[PDB]
Design a protein around this motif. Structure first.
Motif, PDB file in Angstrom:
ATOM      1  N   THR A 126       1.055  -0.961   0.154  1.00 43.70           N
ATOM      2  CA  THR A 126      -0.102   0.376   0.203  1.00 43.70           C
ATOM      3  C   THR A 126       1.133   0.894  -0.187  1.00 43.70           C
ATOM      4  O   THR A 126       1.978   1.161   1.021  1.00 43.70           O
ATOM      5  N   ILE A 127       0.879   2.155  -1.202  1.00 44.11           N
ATOM      6  CA  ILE A 127       1.588   3.433  -1.218  1.00 44.11           C
ATOM      7  C   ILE A 127       0.913   4.115  -0.116  1.00 44.11           C
ATOM      8  O   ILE A 127      -0.015   5.004  -1.181  1.00 44.11           O
ATOM      9  N   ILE A 128       1.587   5.020   1.135  1.00 41.44           N
ATOM     10  CA  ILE A 128       0.454   5.977   0.950  1.00 41.44           C
ATOM     11  C   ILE A 128       2.044   7.637   0.693  1.00 41.44           C
ATOM     12  O   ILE A 128       2.798   7.720   1.447  1.00 41.44           O
ATOM     13  N   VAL A 129       0.399   8.381   0.368  1.00 44.41           N
ATOM     14  CA  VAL A 129       1.004   9.741   0.283  1.00 44.41           C
ATOM     15  C   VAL A 129      -0.044  10.555   0.336  1.00 44.41           C
ATOM     16  O   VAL A 129      -0.952  10.153  -0.142  1.00 44.41           O
ATOM     17  N   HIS A 130       0.311  11.696   0.291  1.00 48.60           N
ATOM     18  CA  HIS A 130      -0.858  13.125   1.011  1.00 48.60           C
ATOM     19  C   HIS A 130      -1.299  13.530  -0.883  1.00 48.60           C
ATOM     20  O   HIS A 130      -0.843  13.332  -1.695  1.00 48.60           O
ATOM     21  N   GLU A 131      -3.059  13.451  -0.447  1.00 48.01           N
ATOM     22  CA  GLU A 131      -3.515  14.092  -1.506  1.00 48.01           C
ATOM     23  C   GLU A 131      -3.224  14.923  -2.320  1.00 48.01           C
ATOM     24  O   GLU A 131      -3.574  14.988  -3.770  1.00 48.01           O
ATOM     25  N   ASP A 132      -3.179  15.602  -1.904  1.00 45.61           N
ATOM     26  CA  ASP A 132      -2.084  16.725  -2.639  1.00 45.61           C
ATOM     27  C   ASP A 132      -0.827  16.855  -3.078  1.00 45.61           C
ATOM     28  O   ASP A 132      -1.180  17.127  -4.133  1.00 45.61           O
ATOM     29  N   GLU A 133      -0.188  16.194  -2.873  1.00 49.66           N
ATOM     30  CA  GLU A 133       0.987  16.052  -3.634  1.00 49.66           C
ATOM     31  C   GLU A 133       0.992  14.815  -4.536  1.00 49.66           C
ATOM     32  O   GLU A 133       1.425  15.159  -6.446  1.00 49.66           O
ATOM     33  N   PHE A 134      -0.390  13.999  -4.892  1.00 50.45           N
ATOM     34  CA  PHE A 134      -0.297  13.083  -5.853  1.00 50.45           C
ATOM     35  C   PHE A 134      -1.352  13.743  -6.647  1.00 50.45           C
ATOM     36  O   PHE A 134      -0.204  13.852  -7.985  1.00 50.45           O
ATOM     37  N   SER A 135      -2.296  14.242  -6.364  1.00 47.80           N
ATOM     38  CA  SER A 135      -2.747  15.942  -7.500  1.00 47.80           C
ATOM     39  C   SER A 135      -1.329  16.065  -8.152  1.00 47.80           C
ATOM     40  O   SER A 135      -1.183  16.303  -9.620  1.00 47.80           O
ATOM     41  N   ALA A 137       1.727  15.965  -8.150  1.00 48.92           N
ATOM     42  CA  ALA A 137       2.539  15.354  -9.276  1.00 48.92           C
ATOM     43  C   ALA A 137       2.636  14.970 -10.975  1.00 48.92           C
ATOM     44  O   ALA A 137       2.623  14.773 -12.105  1.00 48.92           O
ATOM     45  N   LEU A 138       1.179  14.894 -10.586  1.00 50.20           N
ATOM     46  CA  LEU A 138       0.446  13.556 -11.867  1.00 50.20           C
ATOM     47  C   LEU A 138      -0.084  15.115 -12.909  1.00 50.20           C
ATOM     48  O   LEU A 138      -0.497  14.276 -14.026  1.00 50.20           O
ATOM     49  N   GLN A 139      -0.395  15.887 -12.229  1.00 40.51           N
ATOM     50  CA  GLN A 139      -0.654  17.918 -13.644  1.00 40.51           C
ATOM     51  C   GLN A 139       0.804  18.065 -14.028  1.00 40.51           C
ATOM     52  O   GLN A 139       0.578  17.775 -15.417  1.00 40.51           O
ATOM     53  N   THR A 140       1.596  17.478 -13.519  1.00 37.09           N
ATOM     54  CA  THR A 140       3.203  17.640 -14.521  1.00 37.09           C
ATOM     55  C   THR A 140       3.521  16.409 -14.935  1.00 37.09           C
ATOM     56  O   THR A 140       4.069  17.152 -16.526  1.00 37.09           O
ATOM     57  N   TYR A 141       3.154  15.468 -14.766  1.00 38.20           N
ATOM     58  CA  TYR A 141       3.009  14.487 -15.707  1.00 38.20           C
ATOM     59  C   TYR A 141       1.808  15.182 -17.392  1.00 38.20           C
ATOM     60  O   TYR A 141       2.435  14.252 -17.994  1.00 38.20           O
ATOM     61  N   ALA A 142       0.863  14.928 -16.413  1.00 41.73           N
ATOM     62  CA  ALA A 142      -0.186  15.307 -17.926  1.00 41.73           C
ATOM     63  C   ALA A 142       0.487  16.253 -18.486  1.00 41.73           C
ATOM     64  O   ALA A 142      -0.448  16.352 -19.852  1.00 41.73           O
ATOM     65  N   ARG A 143       1.221  18.008 -17.913  1.00 43.15           N
ATOM     66  CA  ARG A 143       1.912  18.701 -18.275  1.00 43.15           C
ATOM     67  C   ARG A 143       3.165  18.391 -19.560  1.00 43.15           C
ATOM     68  O   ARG A 143       3.711  19.572 -19.974  1.00 43.15           O
ATOM     69  N   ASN A 144       3.395  17.332 -19.918  1.00 36.84           N
ATOM     70  CA  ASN A 144       4.664  16.243 -19.838  1.00 36.84           C
ATOM     71  C   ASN A 144       5.771  17.584 -19.711  1.00 36.84           C
ATOM     72  O   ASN A 144       6.977  17.851 -20.298  1.00 36.84           O
ATOM     73  N   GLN A 145       6.176  17.207 -17.745  1.00 39.66           N
ATOM     74  CA  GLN A 145       7.492  18.701 -18.454  1.00 39.66           C
ATOM     75  C   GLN A 145       9.053  17.260 -17.899  1.00 39.66           C
ATOM     76  O   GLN A 145       8.079  16.421 -17.074  1.00 39.66           O
ATOM     77  N   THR A 146       9.304  17.936 -18.449  1.00 40.91           N
ATOM     78  CA  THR A 146      10.945  16.999 -18.871  1.00 40.91           C
ATOM     79  C   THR A 146      11.820  17.466 -17.733  1.00 40.91           C
ATOM     80  O   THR A 146      12.842  16.363 -17.857  1.00 40.91           O
TER      81      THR A 146
END
Ligand SMILES: CCCCCC(=O)N[C@H]1CCOC1=O
Ligand SMILES: CCCCCC(=O)N[C@H]1CCOC1=O
Ligand SMILES: [Co+2]
Ligand SMILES: [Co+2]
Ligand SMILES: [Co+2]
Ligand SMILES: [Co+2]
Lengths: 275, 275
Positions: A126-135, A137-146
């Protein structure tokens, strides 16, 4: 009776200004003041507990640096990680005879390149993470930030490996995972959502794992000295004071994210453990 | 018909990292990346309005610098202010034939050393300041400190001169002071409580006076680049986006607190005025 291990996952360097904002400002006598490229440890903590093994943080992915690296070129140049094979988390756990599959809980203090690098290894935990940290990070991925501190290729692997996420909600705190193991929700500060751990060991007593909520003893003060870029500066200071309050109220020792002198004095996984 | 004057109150220098956080981070290729000591203007704005003269900001006190000055030794070394006699606010006002006593409203964008330094001159005006900025400044005063951005000697004089304070409440906004003159409450960010001004001039159109809510065009971006040490980083960003929104909705120019290039292009009080 639990055992706690400190796993040495190598060393990183960066501008000291990232660690301690405006640590040596230009003056009239020294107008082009030089900064320093400081070195500090990247580490992870394994708690072998009867209720199940708990891992706090995951260091950097082995495929981070170099010509095939997932870290962007600028990121590699500013935050270079040096690690021999024996420092890689998968090898540190093998040296302890722990399989990735044996880990029940992984606590992602946050999702930066030096803490979430090996989440992809833990496909049964079970990977435990803060909900806002998860959100965030995922936005950065959606924006293709390299480039930057959230690594596109690491996030891509977490998604492909279908990890078992549990998000800590922004109002949840003091989450009991097992006897004497409690997640501390520090909230926004250094990053969007920072989690720490309080561990009560029978012999050693209380330990607070701060991760990047407190980089070093110099950060901790007093006076408190914030890092050079900071998501939520007010939340950062609030979080350091929360840590001080809990430490005082529980007589706990605070383990900083990246303090060279403190880390040098820790017993590491190759020599033994805490109890 | 109102007239608006830009008064040149000298120059300050400081480490560029104070203005733009981590503007040139150390890397593998340059581990001791040098910073630079940048120069920028300190200025104030007088609006000669039929309903009464309004002053936005007050620059630095003439007794700020020097071994016997009001500013702490360390502060002088990091933020030196250079100003000829003609640049002192009392002289710039004299050159415009305006007595301090003729000012009806003084807007203190905030209470830092380079904006509130001459509040003590205005013993007949209503001094407009954010309530939380007033509180914060007064607390530093009560602690008798010799270094920092809030100057003990300046505050001491404001109290001894019995100024006529009007505090803007933290939830109060868009406060009309006169036809075409509106106080914008940006709240906490750069400091505890930041106020700006929207001015509508018949010919020139809309102008937003941002003061330290936006140091420079580089700060403004996009992307937004925060200062090296920031009191409330989330507030800082929210305030920049509020300024962008208001500028777009009202077709207004934004006048930054300390942009060398922009300031060079302004018509100064010795040459003329805006209408
Ligand atoms: C590009 C800004 C990245 C700044 C934050 C960051 O990722 N800092 C590393 C250094 C060790 O702890 C970290 O997370
Ligand atoms: C020591 C903290 C410095 C606070 C920031 C500050 O006072 N900055 C000056 C520089 C020009 O605009 C300002 O107010
Ligand atoms: Co971090
Ligand atoms: Co870190
Ligand atoms: Co200021
Ligand atoms: Co200023």
């Amino acid at each position: 009776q639990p055992k706690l291990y400190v796993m040495d996952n190598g060393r990183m360097r960066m501008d000291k200004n990232w660690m301690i904002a405006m640590h040596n400002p230009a003056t009239i006598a020294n107008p082009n003041a030089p900064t320093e490229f400081i070195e500090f440890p990247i580490y992870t903590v394994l708690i072998d507990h009867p209720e199940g093994k708990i891992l706090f943080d995951t260091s950097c992915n082995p495929d981070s640096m170099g010509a095939q690296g997932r870290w962007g070129e600028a990121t590699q140049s500013m935050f270079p990680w040096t690690a021999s094979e024996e420092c890689y988390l998968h090898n540190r756990l093998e040296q302890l005879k722990v399989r990735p599959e044996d880990i029940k809980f992984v606590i992602a203090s946050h999702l930066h390149l030096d803490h979430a690098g090996c989440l992809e290894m833990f496909t049964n935990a079970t990977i435990i993470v803060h909900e806002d940290e998860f959100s965030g990070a995922l936005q950065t991925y959606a924006r293709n930030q390299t480039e930057g501190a959230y690594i596109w290729g690491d996030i891509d692997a977490w998604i492909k490996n279908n990890l078992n996420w549990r998000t800590i909600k922004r109002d949840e705190d003091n989450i009991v995972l097992a006897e004497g193991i409690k997640i501390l929700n520090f909230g926004s500060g250094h990053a969007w959502g920072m989690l720490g751990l309080h561990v009560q060991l029978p012999e050693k007593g209380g330990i607070i794992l701060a991760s990047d909520a407190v980089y070093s003893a110099e950060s901790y003060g007093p006076p408190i000295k914030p890092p050079g870029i900071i998501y939520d500066s007010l939340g950062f200071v609030r979080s350091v004071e929360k840590i001080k309050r809990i430490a005082k109220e529980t007589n706990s020792e605070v383990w900083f994210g990246h303090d060279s002198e403190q880390f040098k004095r820790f017993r590491k996984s190759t020599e033994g453990y805490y109890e």
